[PDB]
Design an enzyme around this catalytic site. Structure first.
Site, short mmCIF file in Angstrom:
data_model
loop_
_atom_site.label_atom_id
_atom_site.label_comp_id
_atom_site.label_asym_id
_atom_site.label_seq_id
_atom_site.Cartn_x
_atom_site.Cartn_y
_atom_site.Cartn_z
N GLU A 11 -6.85 -1.35 6.83
CA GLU A 11 -6.91 -2.74 6.40
C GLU A 11 -7.74 -2.97 5.15
O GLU A 11 -7.56 -4.01 4.50
CB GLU A 11 -7.45 -3.63 7.53
CG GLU A 11 -6.58 -3.67 8.77
CD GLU A 11 -5.28 -4.41 8.58
OE1 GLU A 11 -5.09 -5.05 7.53
OE2 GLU A 11 -4.44 -4.34 9.49
N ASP A 20 -2.13 -10.85 2.44
CA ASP A 20 -1.80 -9.59 3.11
C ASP A 20 -0.42 -9.09 2.68
O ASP A 20 0.22 -9.64 1.78
CB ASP A 20 -1.97 -9.72 4.63
CG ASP A 20 -0.88 -10.55 5.31
OD1 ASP A 20 0.11 -10.91 4.66
OD2 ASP A 20 -1.02 -10.84 6.52
#
Ligand code: PYJ
Length: 161
Positions: A11, A20
């Protein structure tokens, strides 16, 4: 290696609001803020999560606090899901991390489509499960990460990390 180090690799860490892989406002270590395209709505979600007016920016400690909460909620959600809990409990500790990783990325909703993979995992048919896991939007949209998670499911080792 452990689940925190694994998801930190997958991440990243960013202290300002970013989008994202799906275009959604996020912060920290993959903490999704909202699917709304309104940045002000994302800033409001951030302030609500942190407890102060952040203006779109947080500290490393704050990012790590959200990450602790998010990992905890991901695994507790697995245990509260009657379809996922028996498969999760059937796994060894390393493969359990792969499960947490996938749920963290996709949610239990995105995991609803993995019924056939779940059965193969519970059967410990590892190569078959890995083939089945890759026949997915998940794999096609994030192949390098999915390959790491799938190798973890296939082998029960940390070789991909
Ligand atoms: C589909 C991800 C997963 C795998 C095993 C157990 C729970 C959840």
């Amino acid at each position: 290696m452990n689940i925190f180090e694994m998801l930190r690799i997958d991440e990243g860490l960013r202290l300002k609001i970013y989008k994202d892989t799906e275009g959604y406002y996020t912060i920290g270590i993959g903490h999704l803020l909202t699917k709304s395209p309104d940045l002000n709505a994302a800033k409001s979600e951030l302030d609500k999560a942190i407890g102060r007016n952040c203006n779109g920016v947080i500290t490393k400690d704050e990012a790590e606090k959200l990450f602790n909460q998010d990992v905890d909620a991901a695994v507790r959600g697995i245990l509260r899901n009657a379809k996922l809990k028996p498969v999760y409990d059937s796994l060894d500790a390393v493969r359990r991390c792969a499960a947490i990783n996938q749920v963290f990325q996709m949610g239990e909703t995105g995991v609803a489509g993995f019924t056939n993979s779940l059965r193969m995992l519970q059967q410990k048919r590892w190569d078959e499960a890995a083939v089945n896991l890759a026949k997915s939007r998940w794999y096609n949209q994030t192949p390098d990460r999915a390959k790491r998670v799938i190798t973890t499911f296939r082998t029960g080792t940390w070789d991909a990390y």
